[PDB]
Every structure is written in C-alpha cells, then in structure tokens.
Paper text:
[name] is a restriction factor that blocks infection of certain immune cells by HIV-1. [name] is a GTP/dGTP-activated deoxynucleotide triphosphohydrolase. Human [name] is a 626 amino acid protein comprising an N-terminal nuclear localisation signal, two major structural domains; a sterile alpha motif (SAM) and an HD domain, together with CtD, a C-terminal region required for interaction with Vpx isolated from SIV that infects sooty mangabey (SIVsmm). The HD domain contains the active site of the protein and in combination with N- and C-terminal sequences also incorporates the two allosteric nucleotide-binding sites, AL1 and AL2, that regulate the enzyme through combined binding of G-based (AL1) and deoxynucleoside (AL2) triphosphates.
Residue numbers in the entry:
A (entry chain B), C (entry chain B): 113 to 277, 284 to 463, 466 to 506, 517 to 529, 548 to 583
B (entry chain A), D (entry chain A): 110 to 276, 285 to 505, 517 to 531, 547 to 582
The structure:
Amino acid sequence: DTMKVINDPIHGHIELHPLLVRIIDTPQFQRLRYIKQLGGGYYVFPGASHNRFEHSLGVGYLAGCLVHALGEKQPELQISERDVLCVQIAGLCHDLGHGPFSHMFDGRFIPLARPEVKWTHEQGSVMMFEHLINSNGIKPVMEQYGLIPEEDICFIKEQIVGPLELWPYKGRPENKSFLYEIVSNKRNGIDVDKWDYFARDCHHLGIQNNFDYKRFIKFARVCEVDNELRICARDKEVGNLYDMFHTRNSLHRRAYQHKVGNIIDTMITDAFLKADDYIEITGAGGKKYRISTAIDDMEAYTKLTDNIFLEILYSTDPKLKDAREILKQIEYRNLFKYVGETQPTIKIKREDYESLPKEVASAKPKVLLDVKLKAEDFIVDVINMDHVSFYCKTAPNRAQLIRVYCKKVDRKSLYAARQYFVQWCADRNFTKPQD
Amino acid sequence: IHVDTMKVINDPIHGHIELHPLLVRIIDTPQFQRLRYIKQLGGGYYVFPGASHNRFEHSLGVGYLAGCLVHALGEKQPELQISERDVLCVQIAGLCHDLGHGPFSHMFDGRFIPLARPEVKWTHEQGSVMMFEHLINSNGIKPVMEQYGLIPEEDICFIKEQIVGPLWPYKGRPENKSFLYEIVSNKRNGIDVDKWDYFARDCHHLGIQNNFDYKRFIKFARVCEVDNELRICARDKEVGNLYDMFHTRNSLHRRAYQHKVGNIIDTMITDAFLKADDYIEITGAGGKKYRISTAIDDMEAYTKLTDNIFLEILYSTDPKLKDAREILKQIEYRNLFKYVGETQPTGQIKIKREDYESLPKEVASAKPKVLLDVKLKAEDFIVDVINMHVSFYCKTAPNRAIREQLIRVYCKKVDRKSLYAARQYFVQWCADRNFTKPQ
Amino acid sequence: DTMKVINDPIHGHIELHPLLVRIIDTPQFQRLRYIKQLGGGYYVFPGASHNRFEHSLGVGYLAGCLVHALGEKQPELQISERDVLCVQIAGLCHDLGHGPFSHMFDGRFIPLARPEVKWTHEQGSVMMFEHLINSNGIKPVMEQYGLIPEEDICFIKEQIVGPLELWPYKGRPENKSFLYEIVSNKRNGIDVDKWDYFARDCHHLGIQNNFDYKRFIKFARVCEVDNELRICARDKEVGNLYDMFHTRNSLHRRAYQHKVGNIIDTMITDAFLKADDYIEITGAGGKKYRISTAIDDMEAYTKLTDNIFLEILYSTDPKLKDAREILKQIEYRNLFKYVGETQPTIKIKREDYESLPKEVASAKPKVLLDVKLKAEDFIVDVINMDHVSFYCKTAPNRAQLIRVYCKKVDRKSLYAARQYFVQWCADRNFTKPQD
Amino acid sequence: IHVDTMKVINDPIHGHIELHPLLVRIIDTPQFQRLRYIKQLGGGYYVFPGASHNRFEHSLGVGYLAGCLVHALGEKQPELQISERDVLCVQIAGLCHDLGHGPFSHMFDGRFIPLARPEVKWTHEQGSVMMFEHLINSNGIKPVMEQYGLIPEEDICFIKEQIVGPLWPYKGRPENKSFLYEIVSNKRNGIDVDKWDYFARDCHHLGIQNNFDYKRFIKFARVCEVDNELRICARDKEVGNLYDMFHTRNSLHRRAYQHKVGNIIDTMITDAFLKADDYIEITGAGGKKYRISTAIDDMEAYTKLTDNIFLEILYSTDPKLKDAREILKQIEYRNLFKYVGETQPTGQIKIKREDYESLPKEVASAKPKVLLDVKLKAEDFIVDVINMHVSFYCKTAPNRAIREQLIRVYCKKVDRKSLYAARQYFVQWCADRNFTKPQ
Ligand SMILES: Nc1nc2c(ncn2[C@H]2CC[C@@H](COP(=O)(O)OP(=O)(O)OP(=O)(O)O)O2)c(=O)[nH]1
Ligand SMILES: Nc1nc2c(ncn2[C@H]2CC[C@@H](COP(=O)(O)OP(=O)(O)OP(=O)(O)O)O2)c(=O)[nH]1
Ligand SMILES: Nc1nc2c(ncn2[C@H]2CC[C@@H](COP(=O)(O)OP(=O)(O)OP(=O)(O)O)O2)c(=O)[nH]1
Ligand SMILES: Nc1nc2c(ncn2[C@H]2CC[C@@H](COP(=O)(O)OP(=O)(O)OP(=O)(O)O)O2)c(=O)[nH]1
Ligand SMILES: Nc1nc2c(ncn2[C@H]2CC[C@@H](COP(=O)(O)OP(=O)(O)OP(=O)(O)O)O2)c(=O)[nH]1
Ligand SMILES: Nc1nc2c(ncn2[C@H]2CC[C@@H](COP(=O)(O)OP(=O)(O)OP(=O)(O)O)O2)c(=O)[nH]1
Ligand SMILES: Nc1nc2c(ncn2[C@H]2CC[C@@H](COP(=O)(O)OP(=O)(O)OP(=O)(O)O)O2)c(=O)[nH]1
Ligand SMILES: Nc1nc2c(ncn2[C@H]2CC[C@@H](COP(=O)(O)OP(=O)(O)OP(=O)(O)O)O2)c(=O)[nH]1
Ligand SMILES: [Fe+3]
Ligand SMILES: [Fe+3]
Ligand SMILES: [Fe+3]
Ligand SMILES: [Fe+3]
Ligand SMILES: [Mg+2]
Ligand SMILES: [Mg+2]
Ligand SMILES: [Mg+2]
Ligand SMILES: [Mg+2]
C-alpha cells in the first residue's frame, strides 16, 4: 500500500514494489516502449500497436502472483520474501534483450547478417539486465531490500536463460526447484510469460482469450514428481488447459504465421541489410557499431529500437538509397509476392538461412522456363514451429515452415519463380505439394 | 466496386472493417501511413502502458463508422437522396480527418506551436486539409476519384469542409443534404463518429469500459426537419444510451486526458522540442530545410514529422542538443517536473494562444508573502493550460422533431527548498491575477 | 482445496466451506431457485430469468472475500477463522426471506393484503434462517467447525436485519464493528449484497457493470473514524465509486423503475389478491394457511414461491376464475394502461397503500367527465426511491414515485381516468405536472 | 409494417431485437409464453447456478438470427428472389422451432417418454409442429398472416417443414429457393441459427466464452450452386471462425451437456415423473383428463405442461405421491444417485429407444465374479444413455463452389456395501454385452 500502482488493460491494477520501480525507470528498461510486440504484424493488424514494455510489466506481475499464491497455500515450501522479488525481477526483465521488431531480429536478421554468430534475444536479456544494474547502481538498492546480489542475480539470469554453466542451477537449491518453472518453462512450454502475451496479443488482435490464468494460479499446487519438486494443476483444470492450447493454436495460425505479416517482416529485414553498412550507432568508449554488431555492446544496443525503421525511411543520404526504396515499397504496399510454402519431413538450421536463396535459384526445373532468375530475386522465409502432471482434490501431493517469396511482380516472371521453387522443394526432398 | 469483394481489415473495436478500393488507394500512401507513427494519447502512454495505440488505427475506425452512418440513413430514408458518391466522400472525410496531427497529437497544436510561434494561428484540422491535398496530388488520386464516379473539384471541397468546416456557407454540397456535415465533425452538439471511435478505442486501451453503444445508435438514427433545416435525430428511447456516452466522455477527460503526470510529461517533451528546434533540420519541398516549428508550412517536410523526433533527440550525439537530450532522460529516469498546484479562472477571461509564451514570466515576478531562502528564475517555472442540443424523434411520429479552463503550475527544481518556495510564487500569482485561491 | 467449488458466470469459481454446503443443500435454501430476482422484470427483459438462489451464493462469496482481504492486510483486527465463516453465512442467507417475485411481495402485496402487518423480507430471512438450522440440525455442525451458536447466530441475524434489541449489537464487540458493514450497510448503502446484484442484474439485463469490486476489496482498509472502527476506501478509488453510483442509477432508471415492468408486477399482485381466499398452503401441524398468512409460519412459507403464479394459471377451480383471468391477460399482453406519475414533495406510508385507489376515484375533477370510475378501476403504484470516508497512500489509518394505472382500455374512458388522476395529484398536493 | 416502427426487445446476447407485429401476435399467446416456464438446460441448472435461462428467450433469439440471415442474403444477392414473405416465414420458423419442448427440455423427449411409453416414437420437433398448429388455430393467426401478405395454406406448411423436415421432397417452397431450408435447421452439416443462438446463450450463462462470431459469418454468407443444388456458402477466410464454433460445441458437450451430476439429476427427476404419472391429471381438450406421458397426444393439456410439474409433486400433500415426493427431496438434500462408471459401445450397435425400459433388468441379472455380502434388485439400478460438409466461396469467384454413444450406470443405494457391489454388476454386464472394459 506504499508501493506504486500501474493501471493495466489486461490485469487491471498492478502494484509494484519500490525495487522494481527503480529498475523500470532506466534507459535499459524504458527501451522496450519502442519495440513492437508482433513486429511486422502491426502492418496487418492495426490493433497490434503494443510494445514489449507493457508485456514485460505483465509477466513480472503474473510472476509475482504465482509464487505468492503457492507459498500461502503451502507454507511448507519455505518461499522467502526475497524469493518473490527475485521471480518478479526475472519476469520484468525476461524480454530486455529483444531487438527491433522483436522476433525478426534474432529469428531472421542476425542469422542473415551474421550466420557465424550464435545469438538469441534471451542472452541479450541476460546481458542487458547486467548492464542495467551496473549503469544505474541497482546492486546497493538490491542489498537495501534484503537481496544478496551474487546469489540472486545468478538466480534471476537462470530464470530467463536457463543454467549458466545432476543439478545445473547455481542460484538456488533443489528444494525450491519449482521457482524455475515460473518465468520460463522449457519443459512443456507452460509459464507466465506466455500466459501474458496470449491475453495481451488476443486483446490487441481482437481474438478471444480462452485461458483463465487467475483461476489456474488459484488452484495451482506444488507436488513431488519423480523426486523433483514441481508445479501441478488441479485435475478439474484440464478443461482450462485444453483451452490454453487452443488459444495458442489460433494465435500462431492467424497472427504469428500470417502470410503478409511475415513477408513484411522479411522486407524490413532486407531493408536493414542494405542499410547495415551505412548506419552508425555509438557504443561504449564512443566506438562506432553497425546494426548487426550493436548486439556486441549493450550500451549501443540500448539505442537500437524500432526507431531505425523511420531513421532509414526519413534519411536523405544516397548511400541508404537502396535500403530506403524497400521501406518506401512497404508504404505504397508493393510487397514481395507469395510463391508458396513447404515443410521438411530434419530442419533447416539458422546458420544455413543465408545459403537458401542461392539453392532455390540454382535448381534446374524439368520444364522449360521463359524467364530466368538470380538469387537476388528470391526470399525464403524460415518459420519455426514450437508433459504436465496433475494432482487430485481428495489426495493432495500425488501426481518448421519455409516460405518462398519473389521480388518481381509481373505475371509471366511470377510463374518462373514458381518452377524454381517446386523443383527446389522436391530436390532437397521437402514436401512436394501444394496446389 | 461490387460489394463483398472489398479488402477487409480486422479491428479490435469494430471487428472486420471493409474498405472500398478508392479508400485503400488513399490509405496506402506515405501521407496516410504516417499516422502509424503518432501516438493517440501522446504522453499518456507514459502513464497508461496499455495506451500504445496510434492515430492510424483510429482514423481507419472513423472512416468505417462514417460509412455505417450515411449508409444506414440512405437505406431507411431514400427521400434524403444519399448517393454512393456521398457515401464515399463521407468515408474519405472520416478517414483523413486526423491527417494533420503532429508528434504526440494534441501536444503539438495545443501547446508546442503556440509556444514556438505565438503569432501563428494553427490547428491540426487545417493541417488535415493541407495534408489531404498533398496526399491526393502527390499520389494522383483525382483520376481514381473520377474513375469511381466522384467529381474531384466538387467532392474534394466537400471532403475538406467535412473536416475543418466552411472554407448557406458550404460550397461542397447543397443545403438539401446538409445533414451530412453532422457525421464526421459535429460542432453544435459534439456527437459524431470521431468522438464515438476514440471514446471506444481509448477505453479499450485504458481498460475503461465504454457505455455508449454506437452500433445501436446508428441503427435507430434518423434525419428530420429542424427549424426548416435538415438534421440527424435519435429515437426518444436512445436517451439512456446518450446518458452513457457523456458519462464515458466525462470519465475519460477527468481520469485520462487531464491526468497530472501525463500532462507534466507532455510539457517536458514540449520543453525538449523548444531547446532543440534551432538545431534540427527536416527536408521539405525543393530540398528546402525546415525546423520542427516551421514544418507545418510545407507538407513535404511535415510528412516526415512524427513521434520519431522524440527518439532522434534521444539518440542524438550532437552536443548542441545537450540541453534537450538531458530533459528526455529525466523522463527515462522518471525525474519529472513536480506538481505544485491547480487553479481555475472561474467567471473570468480565458488564456489566449498569443499569451502562452508570456505566462511563466508573470508567475516568476510575483511577490511571495514571506520571503524564501530560495529565489527562483522564470526558467524554473512551467504553466500548463488545460481546456475542457440533440433533437429526437418518436416512433409514432418518425419525422417530427422533439427536444471550463484549468491552469496548473510545475517547477523544474524539486529540491525541498525550492519546492515550498515555488508553492507561494504560485499562490500569490493566483491571488493577483484574479484566479481562485488554490487548495 | 478439500472444499466444494461452484462455477459461477459472474465471479468464476466460488469455493464453498463444507459448513456452507450443509446449509445450502436444504429445502429452505434451495427454495431461492424458484424466485425471480427482478420479479415482473422478466416479462420485459427476457434475459432476467435469474433467481434469488444464484444471487445468494454471490453475496456470500463476496462477503468472505472482503473479511479475508482485510484481515491479511491488517492482522491488527483480530479477525478469527470463526468470523470469516459467520460473515459468509450471513451473506448466503440474507435473502432467505424473500417471497414470490421478490420485492413485489413485501413491497406491495403484503401491504395490500395485510396493511395491519409490519413485514419485510429481511425478517423473513431471519425467521427462515432460524427455521433452517433447527429443521436440519445445523447447530451441531456449527459447533463441529468451531462456532458457538448462541453467540454467532445472533451475529448472523444482526448482519442481515440489524440490532435485535451506546452499542446495540449483542453478537459481537465494538472492536470488530467493521464486520457489520459487510453484508448489509444501511449507513450509506455500500456493501457486498448490492455489489453482487449489480454485476448480476447487469449481466442478465445486458447492461454494462462499471464498478470493479475485485479492485475495491483489494485496496480496502479498516480505519478509525469518529472513534468507531470502519471500512475505508483508498483515495484513488473515488473514480471507481463515482462509477458504482452511475451503474446504480442506470439499473434503477432502466430496469427497477420500468413502466411496463411495474405494471405487470401490480397485475400479478392483483391476481394474488383475488386468489388469496381460495389457495391453501400446508404449514406446521398440518394447519392451513393462505398466501398472505403464509409469512406467519416458516414451514408454510418454504413452499411459497413463484410456483403460485402457474398454479393459479393452470387451475380449473371456478373459485379462482377471477384471479385466473388477470394472469391470462398478461399472457395475451392485455395489460393495465399507463395514466401518469407523480412524487410527493412527506411520503405515502405502506399502511396507506390500500386506501389510495379510493382517494383517487373519489376526487372531483373541475372539468366535466364523460364516463365515471369506481375505485376498482384504479391501480396506484408506490415506487420507493432509495458519507463514505477514505484513507491516503502515504498516511494509512487516517480519514418515492407514485404511478396510477387504469384497468379499462378504450380511448374515451382512458381519458376519464386521466382527469381523476390530475385532480388527485393536485388535491393531496403532490406535484401537478406532467405532459 | 413500415421499418423502424417495430417492437424492440432488449436481449443480453443479441442486444436489441426488432419484432414484426405478426411475430409479436404469435409471441403474445399462451402457447408461446409457455416457454418462459421451461429451463433450457433442464437439470443443468442444479450444477450451474448461472444457467437459469428458459426456452422463451432462446426462441426469440433464433427468430432474430433467422431474420438476419435471409435478409442479409436477399440484400446482397437479389437473383435469389427472397421475398419479404419469405423473410417472415423464416422468422416464424425460427421463433417456433422449440415450441414442442417439455419439462426440463431434452430430459422429456430424450429419456422420460421413451421410459414412459416405449412403443411410441416421439420427438419435440414434431411437438413444435403440433403446438404451432394449436397456436395459430386457437388464436386466429391465419387472418393476420393473410393481412401481411402471407398465404396460410402454402406458408404454414413451409414453416412446419423448416422445423421438422419434409412432412424434391418439400411442398412448402419450390426447389429454386431450397437454400432457405438450411437456415433454421440444417441436418447435413449442422450449421444453423438454432445452434448459433444456444451456443452463445448457454456460454453466457455458463460463464463459457463463445469463439464463433455469428454477426461476421452472416455478413459474408453467400448462396451458391452446389451439385446443381442451391446452398449456403461461407467465404474461405471464415474457416478460422468455423474452427472456433466447433471448439465451442465440443467444450459445451463435454463440459456442460454431458456433466455427470447434471445428468444424474436429470435421471432422478425422470424417475420421479414415472412414479407420479398415474396420480397426476392434466386437463386437455373437451375437459378430458390426461397424464404427464399422454399429454403429448393433446395440445390443450400440453400447453399447461411445464417445469411447474416439478414443484407440484414437491409441494403436493397427496400420499399417493409419497414415492415421487421423497425422491425430489433427496435432490433438495443433495442425496443423489451415485456414479458407478461409464462405458461406450465402440464399433458396436447403439441402444434403441424401444430398449431403454429393458436396460436396468439386464444389468441387475449379471453374475459378478466374486459374490458380494450385498445383493441388488433391478429397482436399485439406473442406466443413462448419452448421445453425442460445408461449402465455401472465394472472393475473386463469388459464385463458384469450393470445399459416439455413452452409457453410464448409477445406483440408488449408496451405502458402502451396496456401492462396491454395484461396481461389479456393471463391470460384468459390460463384459457380457460387448462394451469396453470400464476404467
Ligand atoms: N493495403 C493495406 N492493407 C492493410 C493495411 N493494414 C492492414 N492491412 C491488412 C488488410 C489486408 C491485409 C493484407 O493486405 P495486402 O495488400 O498486404 O495483401 P493482399 O490483401 O493479399 O493483396 P490482394 O488483395 O491484392 O490479394 O493486411 C494497410 O495499411 N494497407
Ligand atoms: N514472424 C516471426 N515470428 C516468430 C519468430 N520466432 C518466434 N516467433 C513468434 C512465434 C510465437 C512467439 C513466441 O513468443 P515467446 O514465447 O518466445 O515469448 P516472447 O515474449 O516473444 O519472447 P521470450 O521467449 O524472450 O519471452 O514468437 C520468427 O522468427 N518470425
Ligand atoms: N514511476 C513510473 N510510473 C509509471 C510508469 N508507467 C506508468 N506509470 C504510471 C503509474 C503511476 C504513475 C505515477 O507517475 P510518477 O512516476 O510520476 O509518480 P508520482 O505521481 O510522481 O508519485 P507517486 O509515487 O505518488 O505516484 O505513472 C513507469 O514506467 N514508471
Ligand atoms: N490534456 C490535454 N487533452 C486535450 C488537449 N487537446 C485536446 N484534448 C482532448 C480533448 C478531446 C480529446 C480528443 O480530441 P478530439 O475530440 O479533438 O478528437 P481527435 O481525434 O483527437 O482530433 P480531431 O478533432 O481532429 O478529430 O483530447 C490538450 O491540449 N491537452
Ligand atoms: N408484447 C410483448 N413484449 C415483450 C415481451 N417480452 C418482453 N417484452 C418487451 C418488449 C416491449 C416491452 C413492453 O411491451 P408492452 O407490449 O408490454 O408495452 P408497450 O410496448 O408500451 O405497448 P405499445 O407498443 O402498444 O405501446 O416489453 C413479450 O413477451 N411480449
Ligand atoms: N418493482 C419493485 N422493485 C423494488 C421494490 N422495492 C425495492 N425494489 C428494488 C429496487 C432496487 C432493489 C433493491 O434491492 P436490495 O438492495 O434491497 O437487495 P435485495 O437482494 O433485492 O434484497 P435485500 O435487501 O434483502 O438484500 O429492489 C418494489 O416495491 N417494487
Ligand atoms: N452440493 C451442491 N452442489 C452444487 C449446488 N449447485 C451447484 N452445484 C455443483 C457444484 C459442484 C457440483 C457437485 O455436485 P454434487 O453436490 O453432487 O457433489 P459430488 O459430485 O457428488 O461430489 P464432490 O464433492 O466430489 O463434488 O454441483 C448445490 O446447491 N449444492
Ligand atoms: N445430456 C444430454 N444432452 C442432450 C440430450 N439431448 C440433446 N442434448 C444436447 C445436444 C445438443 C443440445 C441442444 O440440443 P439441440 O441442438 O437439439 O437444440 P435445441 O434448441 O435444444 O432443440 P431443437 O433441436 O429442437 O432446436 O442438447 C440428452 O438427452 N441428454
Ligand atoms: Fe515474453
Ligand atoms: Fe479523430
Ligand atoms: Fe440481495
Ligand atoms: Fe433451439
Ligand atoms: Mg501517483
Ligand atoms: Mg489478403
Ligand atoms: Mg465433484
Ligand atoms: Mg414500449
């Protein structure tokens, strides 16, 4: 009641502990106001204007409510006041590392710009979180409220990215193992992160959200399973869960995998690439970095947001003329044309993403072709497709898609790109159809 | 353009919105797509995290609602002579009404420009007229208008009049279809599709409920003769719906638009724009260079003027921008101007746009009752100016008619000493410029 | 988690303590399934089919959530596990005493049938609650879970009806005074009872419900005010409260005061009256009671529900022919015709309700009348119209309508009833208009 | 009946519903108003307290949706020759489709009547036809039909066919408007306004969300030629909406309609009706006396047969009703039949309506592997029978076509000894009548 309250459209009023407020009001956190949640989705769904910032607030809030709910119903667990804060901090900072247009950056751009590099936004989040506390002297404030930084910061990072190095976690002992299933749950993909963006994306997409997370948390319990401590749902809650997965399927099919949405995101990527050489971002020690290299220094990365889209678009510099023209095509709605899609029966690896258009253009279609295509005329889009145990009332504590687009939009040539593609699919024997 | 073959855009408020190809042609332009880059509530976003929405989706909504209103009237009252041409012209009017808005919306024409160019009289509504002209000229929309049966010389004027008013005063349409001018912007009773959309839209993002059901209201809407003039009438039963709209508007103004911290942030951003104006160049027509404040004079530069300017100052390295850049960071670090108080000129004269620049000086020159260990210059004061009839029909007689200013003060110095000093400069200034004694 | 869960459309899942379940599964509680919430409103609003039963569950649930929320945030209050149950029981049973078509019964019918009698449904609730525990042996079960019946039952009754006899309450001491503001709050009309039926009636009427009760309870605090302990709202919650009152105004104006709705309810009352003599309900000791007398014996009253409407309607008995014809008029939608409405500047007392039609018909309108009316041709409907202190963040713990309808529906005579009415209003100088 | 002068009824699902005077005349009858007194989900109410809604409001909804569908088609596809007369006939069909339902809805025709009169083949759909005939005859609706341009002999048949099917098989309308028969009741693909309404309605009261947007689906609905037959087609883009409807139906069947306790209660009430049938008299035509089970033979008695019969047994003093009355109290006291188990005849033959009476006897006659200290008669067993293609069009080619049984067992004796005894009678009976081994 001495805390901060932020009014939220999804969760209503979210009360924020002073320590969380201190972290949020920094350049490194406020940065997330400037990155669209659904990336290019906005250019298909006008309601999807929401950014990573409000999402981060949501996951942190939900993070806090889960730990708190469990601890009261099971004092056995030895959940400390310190633990609750640490889970909340993990929730708030889990997406700190996302780049321009979110999943476009680490999912396509960086692979294309630096196939060499193994990079995900989660490690960005770890790196950016470390940068945040040092730049703003959060560690004293952490100590002030009863947290021990050496132990807890490790815990915080582990909740986001997983084990940093029989029991892999250095930040917390096995007896509070259930904490690591809260913010990021790899072991079935059930956690508060996704609960939030479901409700959140649905709200902004005008899609009904099916899963009642308030209820699920209320009935949530910690049970022993295979002599490991983990979070378990009431038997009656299965219907709720059937339903969460159905909301998920709807979001992935209608929104995240949208044909035009993904095209636009690849156009933006193509634009970033022809601008990469000429754009300068100032990092630590006044050093100069490019878009693709900005991930190497967290000072520079902080200033890398959706802003780069407009900065390229508004630029007069003729070095950027090539990049600028693509973005202008988006405005005029002259977009890459959709050729087709296929799935492999093994999956394409991201270090292979760069190599793919050459392969597509270099195939030899059986049928004679009226016009021939270079590799520069193809865009190939790699779209990656993504148990639970229960407890009973009467007895508690017992249990890839690949698209190809063509840059040329005349009818005759569009039919050329067609045949290169059908051949390419067949000859790396990915599936043969469709019509 | 045969029905059912249109483009459909899915919207969280209105559901699926159908777009005539001509509307689509206007939408798919740099001048239109620009609104994707301007936040609806401006600095409001920094208080309400759900209020991330931009002018773009709002404008689409008003265009859609515009269409639903005239179409509904035309179908149930054929005497009115509502043409498909009229329908399109009303939709285009709805769609482009906010084209002229600048960075952070109302912050721009409502505060910045008055502060930057006090002699100039400028509103975003006339911006919208200018930008619409630039849009149709740059992209050759006029042939397409003719293509679908519109007469550009006559209709473009109609479109502009529906937005900003008369340039019988209206040249764009005859008096016999006068009721059309009550759809997009209704000056008399303030009930129109513009208000309807942003009421519902802002509510959605603010997590505020909307009690006005516009779908219903349009269904029962009628045009009747009033004082020998044609006007839009609501069924008597719809009064309850109207009670709800005004309560929604009252809540939004009091809870959201007049929010203290929201407005503080809006003034800080304005303060930042001012000390940056000299050093920032935007390229206009003929390659000419303009500044933020002069960009409204040339639509070519203005097209490239959006919320982007906030981040540009922010990300800037130039030490000329050191004064501005540091202020924006205070926003990031959440070290903001502190709220001293509020007062109203009740029964008195209202501050004029030509006097905004002059206001902080007057405040700083006051004579505080007890003298303070701290004395404050004019540069440390901020003064914020916040600015605050239906005819019916009954069923049995379907065509017969029936029937503030706030000023706040913030201080740039929030050290304990200056703050209570800042208190009495304000209280004294209020006493001596005839405002209510603050509380 | 060993409790019962009932799924509710307004509140979601409501968990019920075993003791509450024991009380609910009795003829005396289950009775409320058979009484419509809005009475004659259903015949205007097809969505308002809901009954007192589900409403009672709601108020009990909300009752429990308020006490529980306060006790955790202020352990100072000395709220016992026993107290929480007692507030919940009060919530669940507060409407036990309502009769057929709810407010029609005690608000019009009983006054007309027995003007002599001073009767409200709240005392019914007290009487019916007492009858419930004795008939079903609840007192042992009460003792079983740690309740002391002599002390607590008094507390329970006091929360519903007020003081039974400086400090008026015998059931609880002044230091837990705040408990009496939860289920029924006379001292500003702010309590959980109304919170529920707002949300509930709104849901079924298709009216938006403005008040967020979940939030209000979350921020609710107990403060000292005028050296009496009472419940206080956060300063920020004023906007929420402005809003509760606006929802209230909407419900009263659009629904509860509906012109046709009230007419129908008076028609039903008129029907009950001409049936009252001939209908037999079996009470204690096999004794026979009538509709108006059924309130005297709780055994008989238990079997008095909306059922009486259909029993009259379906009857063959010619003694009931007079009553039956009125009900049949409702089906054919031949209803009392609306003459007009007025308010007094002093209010009509319910012991005077019976006397009113005689007065209306006996006036002498200045203008000459073409047809004259008996008292039997008039229906006069009496519709009764219905501070808060706060606390701050930084410093906790510091602060009648009267309608006249006419039974005859020809144009000439309808205009007669008109003039009797205008005269009657003027000559007991209630307001003169309207047009 | 000029538009905008109709009667409007406010509905929680559809908002305001407009009613043509002819529809109103039908609605304001004892035969129609009767549905106010029959619970939609029957015994479901005793598990879901929010499910208090009755057949009345549901029927109004289907009538409204019926109107929205044909009207939408008629406006966007004038070739189809949809008349205002057709519109009314479809609305009346929608409105009266559930007239024939009895006490607790599906409990009556789905369980009771099979148990009470096993030789008789009866569904509420044919009830609806009978009751509609009784309605129009008793209240002289036929002149009013003629009054608004309807031809009673031709149209009343059409109305009946839209409900129960053929009495080209349809005499009520020619093959050229065949698509009309897919609106109220669609037998082939089960997508119609009936399902749409009660999906949305039940969801509202159960606190279950509805993912099918019917407002949208109707907007984009089209009639196309399919196999040289006229049928209703959805736009290809609407597939996602359809994914949502079926998931809603799947949830409702699994979560609500097939609820264990709900169904148990439905069988107890049925059990109560049976032992009361002999002693209860309902007055039919010519003053003749009928019982509950025979009331379906005469519409005069049936009009007075509603959920009221539940309370009548309950409130009854007659000791003849002692057997029934005590059962209902077990419901009040919540002492219910206990659930033994469930099994399915997967890949096997389905229980026939003529065999329901015979089923408990077969169960009781089984030979349990170990003999029990408790032995059970047939009167102590209850067996419950629970019973569980779209063409599209694409925008660029607007008129070209594209493309279980459960049986449960409950026991009336729930003493610990009888219950585990009851267990193996069931498991053995299942083994020896070829059902799945229970789990
Ligand atoms: N044209 C256009 N569509 C938008 C916009 N915002 C959202 N959308 C939605 C509407 C349709 C969807 C895809 O439209 P596109 O023009 O990109 O692609 P398309 O609809 O397949 O093109 P086409 O109609 O020629 O087949 O995106 C916008 O600003 N302009
Ligand atoms: N268009 C596009 N969408 C992607 C890509 N990769 C993932 N997505 C979408 C699909 C579902 C969604 C998954 O979101 P997450 O569960 O990872 O949650 P998040 O908030 O977005 O990120 P995080 O995991 O760090 O919390 O992201 C991509 O490469 N391109
Ligand atoms: N501090 C902070 N507040 C935010 C943020 N986003 C939205 N808000 C809303 C929630 C509360 C509201 C308070 O604004 P302030 O930070 O200026 O706090 P304050 O008004 O000066 O003081 P107080 O602590 O009493 O609220 O702003 C954010 O990122 N940081
Ligand atoms: N705090 C604050 N609120 C403002 C200011 N100017 C306007 N508002 C409020 C009043 C109504 C609300 C929305 O403005 P409008 O009603 O004019 O609607 P609009 O769509 O935003 O602009 P337009 O009139 O051009 O259509 O914003 C301002 O300067 N400060
Ligand atoms: N006629 C009728 N109206 C209903 C029914 N259910 C709800 N309503 C609503 C619709 C209108 C409202 C009042 O209708 P009434 O016929 O009782 O009174 P009225 O509408 O003022 O009559 P009138 O139209 O002649 O002025 O009640 C119903 O079953 N029949
Ligand atoms: N038609 C009609 N409505 C009435 C009458 N008296 C009261 N009402 C309505 C107006 C508002 C509503 C008030 O409900 P309450 O606050 O009393 O709550 P309740 O659940 O209905 O009863 P209780 O007070 O016992 O809890 O009842 C009446 O005499 N006639
Ligand atoms: N006991 C009871 N349950 C109700 C009532 N109203 C709705 N329900 C729902 C909520 C839970 C569900 C359980 O029904 P039962 O009472 O038969 O309980 P049960 O299924 O036999 O056993 P269990 O305690 O495990 O749920 O019924 C009610 O008034 N009393
Ligand atoms: N548990 C249970 N559910 C049933 C039974 N019969 C039907 N149901 C379910 C299946 C669908 C659901 C609603 O029935 P319908 O789809 O037939 O729609 P309706 O409006 O109720 O009746 P109608 O077909 O006459 O329009 O009720 C039954 O006997 N037992
Ligand atoms: Fe996330
Ligand atoms: Fe606007
Ligand atoms: Fe109540
Ligand atoms: Fe139906
Ligand atoms: Mg504050
Ligand atoms: Mg498309
Ligand atoms: Mg159960
Ligand atoms: Mg009316």
